[PDB]
Ligand binder design. Sequence first.
Ligand SMILES: [K+]
Ligand SMILES: [K+]
Ligand SMILES: [K+]
Ligand SMILES: [K+]
Ligand SMILES: [K+]
Lengths: 318, 318
Amino acid sequence: SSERVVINISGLRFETQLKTLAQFPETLLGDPKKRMRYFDPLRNEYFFDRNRPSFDAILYYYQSGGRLRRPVNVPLDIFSEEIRFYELGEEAMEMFREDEGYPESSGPARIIAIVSVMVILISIVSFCLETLPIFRFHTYSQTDPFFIVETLCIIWWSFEFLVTNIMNIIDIVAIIPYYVTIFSNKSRVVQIFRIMRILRIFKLSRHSKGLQILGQTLKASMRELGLLIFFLFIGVILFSSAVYFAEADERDSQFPSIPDAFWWAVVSMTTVGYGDMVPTTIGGKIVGSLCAIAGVLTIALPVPVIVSNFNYFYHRET
Amino acid sequence: SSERVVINISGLRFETQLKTLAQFPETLLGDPKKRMRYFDPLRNEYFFDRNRPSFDAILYYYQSGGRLRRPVNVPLDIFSEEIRFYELGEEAMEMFREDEGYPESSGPARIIAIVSVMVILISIVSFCLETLPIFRFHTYSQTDPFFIVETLCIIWWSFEFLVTNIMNIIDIVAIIPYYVTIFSNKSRVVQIFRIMRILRIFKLSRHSKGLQILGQTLKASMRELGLLIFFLFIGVILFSSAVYFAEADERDSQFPSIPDAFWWAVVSMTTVGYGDMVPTTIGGKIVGSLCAIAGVLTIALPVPVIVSNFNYFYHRET
Ligand SMILES: [K+]
Ligand SMILES: [K+]
Ligand SMILES: [K+]
Ligand SMILES: [K+]
Ligand SMILES: [K+]
């Protein structure tokens, strides 16, 4: 049907073919029975007392064949109410949303969170006091406070551990390495498990939104971190080699070899500047100069992206 | 012909002179035979059931005389389909594109890339283990593993080297310095060629998109890098001189002369802070204070640009 249709939005006139609207017979504009109500027989046009900027986009949805892009100058909340009213359907709404991006249950079951906080914000506190010198076969490996108030929560964890998903694995591993070494040689293994007790700090994400935000900010940037590292690796292997063949001939060269310079390379590029290794010759100091400059440029490339990814996610869930 | 023409885009009315459209007789709107089909004789106007925001620009193309600028609020993909439909010609499309900016051949000829990866991601690994102290006339210069698995790929390279362009020179130089010293004095030249073996790392760009991206990000910033360096050079020569005439009178002055201070200057401005050279007097510490501050400002000027250049290129080829 060529029969043209005129739609007047608060004074703004839009025209189109009736078949263009026929493409989505389930919508408001596509169903005779539904739009019938907005028809003005004195002017042969359908009239809606609604948002103007929004409609331009709605019409293109039918014209293009399904492209539902919100107009830059149209708020996200207003543009949605329109997609709603004009009834573009669910499958269309989602496709729109996509392209557009229990503690606190009541108070009682909520404060049950605080009893999980300290059980961490102190489980950490203890894990560190162990390494203290003022607190350090059955002794070479290994009752004792740093084993008392510890299990005082070790089973406290395994409790809610039954009361899958990432957020959950944060409690499994938060107790795994423990019963692992408990298991034999009555008289460096199991070492990989005491150092894995630290992960327990991640249990905080269950109450730290800012933290969990960073979580996705990462996976949603895997390709960025990679580039960052790849570049570094490049600048490093590259600069470590130059500084070497520039100091090679030295009765002082602080670079036994290239693999050694690596440490220097990283520390320089990241602008830390420890000093536990520096060029003494001129060639090396020239090489080093660039290494400092290139360091900035290098890092300052993939980073900005990752910066935005957080910029978003942070306010999105806000 | 003054004869005015009325064009109605989905309800939006545009008017113009017929001669304005005559300027491009090869286009749709400029050819009678072509637009004839969209004419509405009851209203004396040509009607198109298409994108509204786009047309404003199309008309100006004829009005201005050839300026085809996409509207800020119009997606790049939509605006192109329009340039297409309205048939503005090829020479116009390119001029538009400009202002707007075999491994994986099938799988088999694709994995032929992995056999090039290790032949690098290990050619590097070896080039570094040479400098190792635990591995070091016919000996003063110079069979040996660091010559075994090396050529084990040296000719492996010269193979595809025949199986011009920048990306290619990455393999030429990736074997040049080798046969160069092979060539005489049976009993510091050729030194400039062992240090040129490192460039071999660049052979990675043939499989590192992120890397090659950085490639253009650079040439497309030559004017930036320059400014960066020029400024530094300025701040350096400038600050090295101040810190000197401020320490000159010292039984400790760590600055033999101005050319010496250079090292300090660079290290300070780039915020590395080695420590292998610092001001001891007050004048010097004042001078140094500014040197640190000015360092930030200096670098933080040309950089942002270069940042954007990558910001773009990165997502462009994405
Ligand atoms: K710094
Ligand atoms: K910094
Ligand atoms: K520093
Ligand atoms: K430092
Ligand atoms: K230092």
